[PDB]
Amino acid sequence: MSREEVESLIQEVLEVYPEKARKDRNKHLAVNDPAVTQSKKCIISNKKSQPGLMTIRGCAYAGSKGVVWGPIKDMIHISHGPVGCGQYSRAGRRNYYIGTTGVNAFVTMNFTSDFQEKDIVFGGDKKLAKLIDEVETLFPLNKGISVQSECPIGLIGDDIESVSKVKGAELSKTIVPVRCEGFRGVSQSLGHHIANDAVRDWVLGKRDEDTTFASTPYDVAIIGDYNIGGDAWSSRILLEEMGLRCVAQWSGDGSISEIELTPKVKLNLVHCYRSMNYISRHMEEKYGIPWMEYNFFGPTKTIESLRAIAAKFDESIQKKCEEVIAKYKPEWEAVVAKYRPRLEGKRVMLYIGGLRPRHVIGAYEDLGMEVVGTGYEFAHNDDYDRTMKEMGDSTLLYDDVTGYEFEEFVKRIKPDLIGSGIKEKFIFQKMGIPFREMHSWDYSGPYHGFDGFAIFARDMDMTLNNPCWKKLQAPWE
Amino acid sequence: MSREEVESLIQEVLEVYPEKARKDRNKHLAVNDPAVTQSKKCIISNKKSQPGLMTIRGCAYAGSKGVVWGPIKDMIHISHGPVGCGQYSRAGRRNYYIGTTGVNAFVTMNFTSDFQEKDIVFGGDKKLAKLIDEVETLFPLNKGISVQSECPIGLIGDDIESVSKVKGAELSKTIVPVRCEGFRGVSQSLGHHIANDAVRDWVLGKRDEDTTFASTPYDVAIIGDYNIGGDAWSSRILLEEMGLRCVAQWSGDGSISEIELTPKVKLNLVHCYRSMNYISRHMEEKYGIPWMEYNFFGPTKTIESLRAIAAKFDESIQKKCEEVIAKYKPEWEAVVAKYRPRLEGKRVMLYIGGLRPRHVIGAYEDLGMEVVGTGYEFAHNDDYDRTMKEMGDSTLLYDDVTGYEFEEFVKRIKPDLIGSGIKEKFIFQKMGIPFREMHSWDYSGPYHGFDGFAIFARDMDMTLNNPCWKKLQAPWE
Amino acid sequence: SQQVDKIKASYPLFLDQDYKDMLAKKRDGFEEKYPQDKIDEVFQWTTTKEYQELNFQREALTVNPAKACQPLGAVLCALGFEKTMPYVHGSQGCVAYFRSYFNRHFREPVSCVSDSMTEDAAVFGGQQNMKDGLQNCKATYKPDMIAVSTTCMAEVIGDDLNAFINNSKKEGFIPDEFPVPFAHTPSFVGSHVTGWDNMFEGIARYFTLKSMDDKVVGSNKKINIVPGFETYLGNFRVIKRMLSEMGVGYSLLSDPEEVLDTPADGQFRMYAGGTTQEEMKDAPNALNTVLLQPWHLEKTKKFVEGTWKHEVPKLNIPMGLDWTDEFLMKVSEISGQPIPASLTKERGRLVDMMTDSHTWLHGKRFALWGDPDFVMGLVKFLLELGCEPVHILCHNGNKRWKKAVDAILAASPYGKNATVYIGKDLWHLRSLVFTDKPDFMIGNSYGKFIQRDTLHKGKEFEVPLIRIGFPIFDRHHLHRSTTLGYEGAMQILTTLVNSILERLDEETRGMQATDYNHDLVR
Amino acid sequence: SQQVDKIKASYPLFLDQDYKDMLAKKRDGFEEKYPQDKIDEVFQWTTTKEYQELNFQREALTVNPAKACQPLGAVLCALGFEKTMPYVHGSQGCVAYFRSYFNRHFREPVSCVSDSMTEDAAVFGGQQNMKDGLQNCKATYKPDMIAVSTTCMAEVIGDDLNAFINNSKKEGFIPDEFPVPFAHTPSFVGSHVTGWDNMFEGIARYFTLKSMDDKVVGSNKKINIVPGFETYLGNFRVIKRMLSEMGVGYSLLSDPEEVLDTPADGQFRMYAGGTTQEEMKDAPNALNTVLLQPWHLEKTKKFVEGTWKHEVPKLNIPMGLDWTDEFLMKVSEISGQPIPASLTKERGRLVDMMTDSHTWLHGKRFALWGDPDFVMGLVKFLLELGCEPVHILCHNGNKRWKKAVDAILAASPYGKNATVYIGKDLWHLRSLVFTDKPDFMIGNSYGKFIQRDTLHKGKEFEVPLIRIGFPIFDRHHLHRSTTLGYEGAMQILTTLVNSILERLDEETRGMQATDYNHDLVR
Ligand code: ICS
Ligand code: ICS
Ligand SMILES: [Ca+2]
Ligand SMILES: [Ca+2]
Ligand SMILES: [Mg+2]
Ligand SMILES: [Mg+2]
């Protein structure tokens, strides 16, 4: 499609809307020009969703509890409020960890205060204090507690900070109040920011006066990898083969102590910019720790990233970097040789959260595929700045896409594959379009690193080329 | 019912038959008189089945392969002829054993010569010789081979004895030809006799000139227990608690060496009279070994049997007998206390093979139940002699019952429970009559001994008193 | 590393030695992990009676609930009406979760909108969100009805749904005649089933309250059927099939079976099937109304009795033999239709299966959970099968319901070792299956973590899960199954007996150890 | 010993220490058992490629066959006719076995008689047994037809069934016009499926050969359907359902579904349902005849084409998506009835399920066995699912059939690693699943012993059995399932994907070892 065809598609689709919605949505849809650096000239983002249009977005509680805090494995995270949020978000996100669940690790459990009417009418702070005592009795090996506020908490005027302070002092325990109520912000995004500030204020400074950690010149932290299907492990292995020491993973497979040790590292390696740039900036301001963005999706990006990271250290690390690259060369070359001829030229549309809609493009290109449309639920303009140069000219960009728009765009563009989430999957399969989940990895993965690229390629091929897709039309029709 | 009512029932049922069948069947149906000692005054048995009447009987191959030889665990038994017999009889009978199947034990496998047309036209003896070589190659730990003839073998004039002699000499292996073709005899019974004579002629004499086995005064063999659901093991335990040494089990869990060691024992203990009286008589004739019948169904019979067996030995065994009886007293008394009040007065009809139709009566009586009809597929008059004194006056006796007869008798008598086989089970359940399989134990057991009585009682109760039986009539009908 | 011809996903990739070594180094270097002996000690303690007693003393903490929140049920109810868009007034995060939750159980699209209230709406409310939301939803998704429920933010701020909808029509955002039934569905009251009841009663009121004067009970010669919160497609289907076989005129009120099972034929169908508006408008003219899941249809019952003047029969859920019989006999009485030969035969085929399988079922002990009607029907059927339902958990149950189940347990000897628990969660149930171990659990996918815990104590302590209930996320297509009627009883019986036999085969598979009992025939 | 409150059956009774010690003493004293190290050595050798080569060189020995003998299939065929008694001329032992075999699979009564020939009949044959047998059977069991087959004794002696039946009528033992169709069914030729073909063609001849002059192809506006040897009740049912939904007139020739599923209502029904004599007599007037299982209906096909003059269509068994589509399209062409909306939707629901489950099915490797038509339909559907059917075993298959399956494998990339074996048995298959291990077996209950053997080598070598085929004796009620049509494809797909997910859950259940991948959602 031509720029003009894409522009006319946008206008065609927007004809369905009442005027207020039409005027708004027009600002959130754009035809890419890789020649632009300032995305605020071409697309609006990080605004409220229009009522009634079937946004795909979640809320701040999802961004805080579901995304940032929930993966921390040796803490207990309380979903504080009525029973739904914590139940719908129980073990939905594949933030993998090693532990003994119910004993020293708690990730896939749902701890809740299960608010009833009396809690709304009279407040939940007394219940929260009692709940904390019950947690301590029944889960003695927990290493800290977080309180993940659901919608009612701030609305009714509860004081979870006071409870957290008083109980934390009483019990000599880290108890973290998080004001991530879903009424705040417009999406998951503000939950990331709230969550980062809670780490800053209640956890990160604990060891500021402690000099006992045995630091080395090669200490790093992986910032913003939630270990989906083991993604952070398949990243860590490479960094340590290169001679680095990964002191912390924020927050996939993460422990409270590794978070507390992070201010001792030499370099913060930021994968998910959107969710963790806030704490990365804090750590540079307060501790002098530099940070850098990287990308472990596919061999081209992984090799570039390894080299850029190694360049921050000495010649010994740069030599090990080239050794790692040489080791894995035949492995990813074999993956390309098998799968690229099966995928070459195929066209993909993506719709994901805050990072992957741009970050996975290189991996598709390593298999000869073209990303012809992409967009984000909750990205900001700094994300779109990073996207426009990654996407081809005249491709389609969509911010906070509506269900209607996404379906209509797909009907016109006719991609060979769509990569999006669970609320999208079953729609597009019925349309006969191969679909891969690009949040959960469709219960596969890892996709990060060299080992992840093999799985990624296998998965894109198994689905795009599956025999089922030739069977949707009955032969009598 | 009175004697007169039962006689009337017999005559009413027989009215359906053509004259020849009516006249025959009348001779096989009797009203019991425990005052009679010569059953040949009362009932005919061990005659041909009438054509077209749906006998429950099997054939001589079932009696030899299925019953006597098949359980011997460390031999390979060849079903010699076309594919059906060996397939239908594969693992149908629960003759339990300890071994490594396919390696040193072979009971649940189906070895066959799978006769084709060329084997019928030109004979199977060359195939048999080649088959034996293949067995030796692929199953080197087998300790002997038997050849279980199916119908075609004698009809086509094959000479399996010659093959067995020549190959046995060549391989220094015991290879046993068994002429158990289903055209011989009238039922399973002649297969027992054929099988016993084959053990006599080809196996039992092997160690006649060996003096190396160390015997003791307390050496016995269990003769005619096929270890259904472990029945022989729950018998053996008691004999050995009583101070005896059980040198052999014929043939449940049996090995070829224990058969060969049997002529060294002091006493043969015969459970199944019908199937193994022949070899027991032979061993008395040739080796001077006495034999005695016993019964391990229910506590009354088991206690009587232990005492009668102990009386054949010295005071030390008689003292151990009383110790065994005292040990198990509280156990079976607890079973009676629990289950007898659940079963008292309930009426049972049985139909089984050659032993159990009389042998289980005492166990039913230990639960307060009454056996109001019994009969056998293939018993002889010496079995009926042993039955008439065990059954009440005016109860119904049936030899080689037809399907029609059994259904009509049940419709009139209206027993609370029926104990018979797989071909009967599903008929009577549709009629709303609780049914227990009294061959396979309905995949339960053991039923022998004190430990078996507990399971028997549990099983009769679970079925007779099951909630399902109150549900067959729809409440709108 | 990967070998291209046999690529490893996470399992078993991370079992490679290099990954194992890396993970050990991470642990030792940076996790400050409790020693394994201490982890073992605490695990063992969590399996004890002493721990159970502390666990059952909880007052404030809930762990691993077995319920969800009201609007989830309102959405499912709404999905059952023709060309109807579920609309949840309040916070959009809730709608992402409701959709995802149902997506994962049905493996189908689930359409639902929010009006995206934000913090600003706390100053004077969500009225503008309602106006623009209704207009936008109608224009974009072209429903013929929008069924409105609420999230907890909207309830706490106190938004008056009725007033807001009325003002939306007054000010021309949607046509006056466009149907916009509503219900308040606070997540801090009851559970998802309560939201279903509230939504249904709201829809029933919308179509009938103001038009009662021309209605005559019995004049349409049909029976209304209200299914309640139901997540097995086969359950909608079996009720319709049985009534059709009997020649009974009926209206199934809330029927999502089509929209939860559209074909993959090249087009997405946002709407399919469903109860029509005409069916709801005409419902008071029925002979009567039967509630399939009465223990969560109490508000609906009061409306149907009080306003439609239907004498709703006292029927249990039609699960198992006796309660299916009672359902059919009552439907026969109401409709005048005889129970047909086909259903009599089907009943007798279930009874035959019971006779066939009774010896393996007898005395088997079960822990089970779910919603109140489902649980009581499962208990009843287990007793009919000669099984013992020893731990009966209903997190969202009430005292009156518990009394009723205790009476069912009293009517059978198979109930003697059973206890009913209300308000308790799956961390409570975990303790019960350690301290008073049953043979199996019957429950939803959250039970898998209990099975995992039991196995960790040892193979002999493992309690296998049998998946019946909602949600089931870790198996495919079980939502197509049936639990109601004779058909559902046959399905449940088959599942139970074969679970017993699969476990027995596992336990007897050990060569020369336990395989003496590895029977070909069972 | 026993504790009265918790009685132990064989498992686990014999694991008690006293029993264990007793069994050790028995072994050591009297069994002269090979040392355990030698047993282990031999077991390991039986898992090797060297052993496999020796195993595949067998010419005379068969071990663990995957077929039965002709008269079994004749009996099943005969059971499908109204008030028909199967009657096997020859030896009564065979009949005890046929009945028991089917009793154990269906958990139903199975009525069949013998005429109890004994050794004396070798002097001049079984004629008197036929005369008295037919008279006795008719009087006692009151069938309206007696369908006669043979055992191998009768075939070897050379009894002329036709002459014997004719003489029975001549001499007044059964009425001249009473139907006594017959077939010679030698157990040393073919297998059970051949006996079905032989019996069916004999019944078809009986009712039609002499009356052809008044017949006109197409005059009754129906299509005949011949099912072949079929042991899933759902297969008879789905075919009738689909034809009925299309409005297609049909006659199912041999239909045992009623007599293999009578209700437990207080009476035994020896006969129920079945194809009527009127249907068989009228069958030449059909438009055409469709053979559901053509690879064992070759004799029937020759008769239908040569005598009825029906142009029997070249159709595969209707299994999987493509072959069900082809079946329905051909039925539409013959009948003039369009494929209705209901079936189009059902098709699309199957396709939806394929899309939903394809990621777990992709590349999964199977060993499988059974009868020829079943096996090739399973192979075809596995290829449609993106699975690899690597070991395809059909003991009773032929060279022409193997060529056809090799062609099917050629039409898909998923067939590249597959081999078809004919004349080979389950001891051959056992070697294949050790030397070229698949993920699962799909087969009958005899496969359980192969699973046991594989586990003994180690958990990582275990190949779980998925039970589809005949006989299934160690699970209850699987005979009620469906394998044909879209319904059968849905059932098969569901069973396969959930077997995969059950095994993955087992492998990921280990606390702090493999449970990182013990996902709630799959
Ligand atoms: S945290 Fe974010 S929506 Fe950066 S909220 Fe979301 S596990 Fe997405 S595109 Mo789900 S900003 Fe992570 C994300 Fe990306 S939950 Fe995962 S896949 S890389
Ligand atoms: S051997 Fe006989 S038919 Fe004595 S052929 Fe039969 S395992 Fe029966 S009544 Mo099946 S003379 Fe044994 C018998 Fe009794 S197979 Fe078993 S139960 S005690
Ligand atoms: Ca789907
Ligand atoms: Ca049955
Ligand atoms: Mg591995
Ligand atoms: Mg797997």
mmCIF file of N, CA, C and O in Angstrom, chain C residues 252-297:
data_model
loop_
_atom_site.group_PDB
_atom_site.id
_atom_site.type_symbol
_atom_site.label_atom_id
_atom_site.label_comp_id
_atom_site.label_asym_id
_atom_site.label_seq_id
_atom_site.Cartn_x
_atom_site.Cartn_y
_atom_site.Cartn_z
ATOM 1 N N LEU C 252 -35.335 -19.843 26.462
ATOM 2 C CA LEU C 252 -34.102 -19.810 27.255
ATOM 3 C C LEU C 252 -33.663 -18.354 27.331
ATOM 4 O O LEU C 252 -33.354 -17.742 26.293
ATOM 5 N N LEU C 253 -33.676 -17.813 28.543
ATOM 6 C CA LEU C 253 -33.465 -16.390 28.792
ATOM 7 C C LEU C 253 -32.024 -16.173 29.286
ATOM 8 O O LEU C 253 -31.709 -16.463 30.440
ATOM 9 N N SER C 254 -31.210 -15.637 28.369
ATOM 10 C CA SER C 254 -29.749 -15.544 28.408
ATOM 11 C C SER C 254 -29.156 -16.840 27.866
ATOM 12 O O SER C 254 -29.083 -17.843 28.549
ATOM 13 N N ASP C 255 -28.774 -16.808 26.585
ATOM 14 C CA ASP C 255 -28.330 -17.972 25.839
ATOM 15 C C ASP C 255 -27.130 -17.600 24.991
ATOM 16 O O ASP C 255 -27.273 -17.186 23.838
ATOM 17 N N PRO C 256 -25.927 -17.703 25.560
ATOM 18 C CA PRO C 256 -24.714 -17.306 24.849
ATOM 19 C C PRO C 256 -24.080 -18.432 24.036
ATOM 20 O O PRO C 256 -22.946 -18.290 23.595
ATOM 21 N N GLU C 257 -24.770 -19.551 23.811
ATOM 22 C CA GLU C 257 -24.084 -20.689 23.207
ATOM 23 C C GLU C 257 -23.593 -20.414 21.789
ATOM 24 O O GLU C 257 -22.528 -20.888 21.423
ATOM 25 N N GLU C 258 -24.327 -19.631 21.007
ATOM 26 C CA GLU C 258 -23.866 -19.319 19.678
ATOM 27 C C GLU C 258 -22.678 -18.348 19.662
ATOM 28 O O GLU C 258 -21.722 -18.539 18.909
ATOM 29 N N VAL C 259 -22.755 -17.292 20.464
ATOM 30 C CA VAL C 259 -21.711 -16.270 20.435
ATOM 31 C C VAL C 259 -20.417 -16.768 21.083
ATOM 32 O O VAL C 259 -19.340 -16.219 20.795
ATOM 33 N N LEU C 260 -20.478 -17.846 21.868
ATOM 34 C CA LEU C 260 -19.290 -18.494 22.433
ATOM 35 C C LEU C 260 -18.838 -19.704 21.627
ATOM 36 O O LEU C 260 -18.012 -20.473 22.119
ATOM 37 N N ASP C 261 -19.313 -19.845 20.391
ATOM 38 C CA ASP C 261 -18.931 -20.977 19.556
ATOM 39 C C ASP C 261 -19.101 -20.688 18.072
ATOM 40 O O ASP C 261 -19.599 -21.507 17.309
ATOM 41 N N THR C 262 -18.672 -19.530 17.628
ATOM 42 C CA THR C 262 -18.803 -19.196 16.207
ATOM 43 C C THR C 262 -17.794 -20.012 15.374
ATOM 44 O O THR C 262 -16.704 -20.331 15.836
ATOM 45 N N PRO C 263 -18.121 -20.320 14.125
ATOM 46 C CA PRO C 263 -17.188 -21.084 13.312
ATOM 47 C C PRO C 263 -16.020 -20.222 12.826
ATOM 48 O O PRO C 263 -16.147 -19.010 12.624
ATOM 49 N N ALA C 264 -14.893 -20.877 12.564
ATOM 50 C CA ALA C 264 -13.746 -20.249 11.905
ATOM 51 C C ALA C 264 -13.898 -20.482 10.413
ATOM 52 O O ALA C 264 -13.435 -21.489 9.875
ATOM 53 N N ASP C 265 -14.580 -19.557 9.753
ATOM 54 C CA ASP C 265 -14.874 -19.681 8.322
ATOM 55 C C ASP C 265 -14.458 -18.464 7.510
ATOM 56 O O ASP C 265 -14.913 -18.316 6.387
ATOM 57 N N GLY C 266 -13.583 -17.628 8.052
ATOM 58 C CA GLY C 266 -13.103 -16.472 7.335
ATOM 59 C C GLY C 266 -13.686 -15.151 7.774
ATOM 60 O O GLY C 266 -13.239 -14.114 7.306
ATOM 61 N N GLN C 267 -14.688 -15.154 8.645
ATOM 62 C CA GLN C 267 -15.184 -13.909 9.184
ATOM 63 C C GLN C 267 -15.378 -13.988 10.668
ATOM 64 O O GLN C 267 -15.707 -15.034 11.226
ATOM 65 N N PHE C 268 -15.130 -12.855 11.310
ATOM 66 C CA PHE C 268 -15.411 -12.634 12.722
ATOM 67 C C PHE C 268 -16.853 -12.153 12.837
ATOM 68 O O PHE C 268 -17.253 -11.210 12.167
ATOM 69 N N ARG C 269 -17.606 -12.804 13.710
ATOM 70 C CA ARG C 269 -18.986 -12.446 14.038
ATOM 71 C C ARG C 269 -19.018 -11.949 15.469
ATOM 72 O O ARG C 269 -18.902 -12.733 16.424
ATOM 73 N N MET C 270 -19.134 -10.627 15.637
ATOM 74 C CA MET C 270 -19.140 -10.073 17.002
ATOM 75 C C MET C 270 -20.335 -10.579 17.799
ATOM 76 O O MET C 270 -20.229 -10.784 19.022
ATOM 77 N N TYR C 271 -21.467 -10.764 17.119
ATOM 78 C CA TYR C 271 -22.693 -11.241 17.758
ATOM 79 C C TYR C 271 -23.167 -12.486 17.029
ATOM 80 O O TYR C 271 -23.008 -12.587 15.822
ATOM 81 N N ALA C 272 -23.800 -13.399 17.771
ATOM 82 C CA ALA C 272 -24.474 -14.563 17.158
ATOM 83 C C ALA C 272 -25.527 -15.091 18.120
ATOM 84 O O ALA C 272 -25.288 -15.178 19.317
ATOM 85 N N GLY C 273 -26.684 -15.476 17.589
ATOM 86 C CA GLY C 273 -27.716 -16.082 18.409
ATOM 87 C C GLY C 273 -28.217 -15.194 19.519
ATOM 88 O O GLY C 273 -28.355 -13.982 19.362
ATOM 89 N N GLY C 274 -28.535 -15.821 20.646
ATOM 90 C CA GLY C 274 -28.983 -15.103 21.826
ATOM 91 C C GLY C 274 -30.481 -14.979 21.968
ATOM 92 O O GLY C 274 -31.267 -15.066 21.026
ATOM 93 N N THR C 275 -30.892 -14.740 23.193
ATOM 94 C CA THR C 275 -32.282 -14.487 23.507
ATOM 95 C C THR C 275 -32.737 -13.185 22.849
ATOM 96 O O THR C 275 -32.055 -12.161 22.947
ATOM 97 N N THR C 276 -33.907 -13.204 22.227
ATOM 98 C CA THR C 276 -34.368 -12.013 21.543
ATOM 99 C C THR C 276 -35.084 -11.062 22.510
ATOM 100 O O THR C 276 -35.566 -11.450 23.574
ATOM 101 N N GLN C 277 -35.191 -9.808 22.097
ATOM 102 C CA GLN C 277 -35.946 -8.829 22.869
ATOM 103 C C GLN C 277 -37.417 -9.242 22.932
ATOM 104 O O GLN C 277 -38.068 -9.060 23.965
ATOM 105 N N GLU C 278 -37.923 -9.803 21.852
ATOM 106 C CA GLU C 278 -39.299 -10.275 21.803
ATOM 107 C C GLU C 278 -39.535 -11.381 22.868
ATOM 108 O O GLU C 278 -40.532 -11.401 23.555
ATOM 109 N N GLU C 279 -38.553 -12.264 23.031
ATOM 110 C CA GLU C 279 -38.662 -13.312 24.049
ATOM 111 C C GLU C 279 -38.741 -12.699 25.455
ATOM 112 O O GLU C 279 -39.494 -13.177 26.304
ATOM 113 N N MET C 280 -37.921 -11.680 25.733
ATOM 114 C CA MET C 280 -37.991 -11.066 27.054
ATOM 115 C C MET C 280 -39.300 -10.323 27.271
ATOM 116 O O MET C 280 -39.908 -10.408 28.342
ATOM 117 N N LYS C 281 -39.753 -9.593 26.250
ATOM 118 C CA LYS C 281 -41.017 -8.852 26.359
ATOM 119 C C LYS C 281 -42.203 -9.789 26.586
ATOM 120 O O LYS C 281 -43.143 -9.438 27.289
ATOM 121 N N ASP C 282 -42.145 -10.979 25.991
ATOM 122 C CA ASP C 282 -43.258 -11.924 26.053
ATOM 123 C C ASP C 282 -43.163 -12.878 27.245
ATOM 124 O O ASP C 282 -44.125 -13.600 27.518
ATOM 125 N N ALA C 283 -42.032 -12.862 27.963
ATOM 126 C CA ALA C 283 -41.792 -13.803 29.037
ATOM 127 C C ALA C 283 -42.881 -13.868 30.118
ATOM 128 O O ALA C 283 -43.148 -14.956 30.621
ATOM 129 N N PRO C 284 -43.527 -12.741 30.491
ATOM 130 C CA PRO C 284 -44.569 -12.868 31.517
ATOM 131 C C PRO C 284 -45.762 -13.711 31.089
ATOM 132 O O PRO C 284 -46.520 -14.161 31.953
ATOM 133 N N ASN C 285 -45.948 -13.895 29.779
ATOM 134 C CA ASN C 285 -47.021 -14.729 29.265
ATOM 135 C C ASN C 285 -46.770 -16.242 29.346
ATOM 136 O O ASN C 285 -47.641 -17.042 28.973
ATOM 137 N N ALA C 286 -45.579 -16.623 29.817
ATOM 138 C CA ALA C 286 -45.254 -18.048 29.995
ATOM 139 C C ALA C 286 -46.125 -18.687 31.078
ATOM 140 O O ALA C 286 -46.691 -17.996 31.925
ATOM 141 N N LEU C 287 -46.223 -20.014 31.029
ATOM 142 C CA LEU C 287 -46.850 -20.782 32.087
ATOM 143 C C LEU C 287 -46.173 -20.582 33.418
ATOM 144 O O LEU C 287 -46.814 -20.582 34.460
ATOM 145 N N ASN C 288 -44.854 -20.499 33.380
ATOM 146 C CA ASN C 288 -44.030 -20.468 34.578
ATOM 147 C C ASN C 288 -42.595 -20.206 34.132
ATOM 148 O O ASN C 288 -42.302 -20.159 32.928
ATOM 149 N N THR C 289 -41.737 -20.034 35.118
ATOM 150 C CA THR C 289 -40.314 -19.788 34.934
ATOM 151 C C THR C 289 -39.564 -20.765 35.829
ATOM 152 O O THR C 289 -39.842 -20.857 37.025
ATOM 153 N N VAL C 290 -38.634 -21.496 35.220
ATOM 154 C CA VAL C 290 -37.770 -22.431 35.935
ATOM 155 C C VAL C 290 -36.351 -21.848 36.013
ATOM 156 O O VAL C 290 -35.765 -21.442 35.001
ATOM 157 N N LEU C 291 -35.816 -21.837 37.228
ATOM 158 C CA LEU C 291 -34.470 -21.365 37.513
ATOM 159 C C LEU C 291 -33.532 -22.554 37.615
ATOM 160 O O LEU C 291 -33.684 -23.407 38.482
ATOM 161 N N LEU C 292 -32.552 -22.645 36.716
ATOM 162 C CA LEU C 292 -31.675 -23.834 36.718
ATOM 163 C C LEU C 292 -30.684 -23.802 37.877
ATOM 164 O O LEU C 292 -30.232 -24.870 38.291
ATOM 165 N N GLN C 293 -30.343 -22.611 38.375
ATOM 166 C CA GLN C 293 -29.316 -22.441 39.420
ATOM 167 C C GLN C 293 -29.881 -21.512 40.473
ATOM 168 O O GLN C 293 -29.513 -20.340 40.594
ATOM 169 N N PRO C 294 -30.873 -22.016 41.230
ATOM 170 C CA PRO C 294 -31.651 -21.137 42.116
ATOM 171 C C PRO C 294 -30.831 -20.470 43.211
ATOM 172 O O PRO C 294 -31.216 -19.379 43.637
ATOM 173 N N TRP C 295 -29.729 -21.060 43.655
ATOM 174 C CA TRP C 295 -28.965 -20.479 44.756
ATOM 175 C C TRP C 295 -28.188 -19.232 44.347
ATOM 176 O O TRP C 295 -27.692 -18.540 45.229
ATOM 177 N N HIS C 296 -28.134 -18.893 43.049
ATOM 178 C CA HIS C 296 -27.700 -17.550 42.709
ATOM 179 C C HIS C 296 -28.687 -16.764 41.875
ATOM 180 O O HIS C 296 -28.303 -15.822 41.211
ATOM 181 N N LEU C 297 -29.964 -17.106 41.960
ATOM 182 C CA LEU C 297 -30.991 -16.431 41.212
ATOM 183 C C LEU C 297 -32.098 -15.894 42.131
ATOM 184 O O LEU C 297 -33.246 -15.804 41.737
#
